[PDB]
Amino acid sequence: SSTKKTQLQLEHLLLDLQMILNGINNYKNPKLTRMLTFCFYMPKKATELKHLQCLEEELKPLEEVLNLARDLISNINVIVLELKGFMCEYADETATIVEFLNRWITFCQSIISTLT
Numbered sequence: 001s002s003t004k005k006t007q008l009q010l011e012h013l014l015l016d017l018q019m020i021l022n023g024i025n026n027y028k029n030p031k032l033t034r035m036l037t038f039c040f041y042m043p044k045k046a047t048e049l050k051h052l053q054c055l056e057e058e059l060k061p062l063e064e065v066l067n068l069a070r071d072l073i074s075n076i077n078v079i080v081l082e083l084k085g086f087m088c089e090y091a092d093e094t095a096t097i098v099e100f101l102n103r104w105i106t107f108c109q110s111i112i113s114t115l116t
């Protein structure tokens with residue numbers, strides 16, 4: 001019931017990020033070009049729960065980029081705090097919101113695989 005809960009917490013996180021990615025790729029979004037000009041930071045390594053601190057630190061720019069077009073941001077925040085309860089090392093190369101979301105979706109799938 002503890003491992004399952006953790007798994008469910010990650011599943012919601014995964015889905016939340018996907019919903020953001022979907023709303024950005026919707027042809028109804030009139031600000032995709034502007035959104036892509038935003039710069040996001042990515043962790044050098046992303047293989048451990050504690051690395052979610054790196055995601056948490058970016059929720060602000062995340063909210064701002066989406067606001068260009070939240071109930072989801074807050075949901076992510078809650079999950080993240082539940083998973084990691086660490087000093088992040090970020091890569092030099094910044095990423096677009098699309099790359100940023102992909103990377104974390106991939107991180108979620110990885111961790112979910114591990115604890116199943």
Ligand SMILES: *SCCCNC(=O)[C@H](C)NC(=O)CNC(=O)[C@H](NC(=N)N)C1CCCCC1
Nearest residue numbers: 037038039040041057058060061062064065094
């Ligand atoms: S590389 C910045 C390109 C110029 N555009 C912006 O600054 C726009 C308005 N906002 C963003 O790109 C959002 N990203 C951030 O706020 C960045 N911080 C984090 N990702 N944590 C900072 C942008 C400004 C330079 C330092 C990073």
